[PDB]
């Protein structure tokens with residue numbers, strides 16, 4: 001049973017205009033089986049639009065490609081992103097009053113490198129408000145997080161979304 005194709009795609013921006021379907025494929029096949037690989041071109045001139053997409057056979061292969069950034073393709077560092085609101089920070093809601101920093105760190109550190117955890121407290125009383133923000137060093141962490149159907153932290157079913 002195959003993961004949905006949309007979750008196996010990487011949009012690659014910043015291409016060299018000399019990158020082709022074939023040279024994009026030869027590069028990104030280092031991290032998995034590619035079922036599709038296309039450079040976007042002008043319909044009349046055939047000149048590259050400077051971006052394209054690759055489709056891997058599995059999500060773990062997408063992860064491997066993202067973990068191998070930075071990618072220099074045909075002499076140019078490109079910008080891969082999963083199938084964009086590119087942010088490094090998430091809102092985590094539903095954590096109630098008993099969730100602490102280490103609960104959030106232990107869970108979210110497996111999505112990416114954490115730089116800030118902010119457990120929100122009431123301005124007047126100091127009581128925990130039941131939500132938090134986590135800032136990572138890179139957007140792919142957030143992209144992986146928000147496509148999951150579920151997040152369970154400290155026994156709580158959490159609401160997680162991109163923040164600003």
Ligand SMILES: CN(C)S(=O)(=O)c1cn[nH]c1
Pocket residue numbers: 067109110111112113138140141
């Ligand atoms: C470079 N990466 C492996 S990452 O920092 O995005 C990461 C850390 N844990 N999961 C992903």
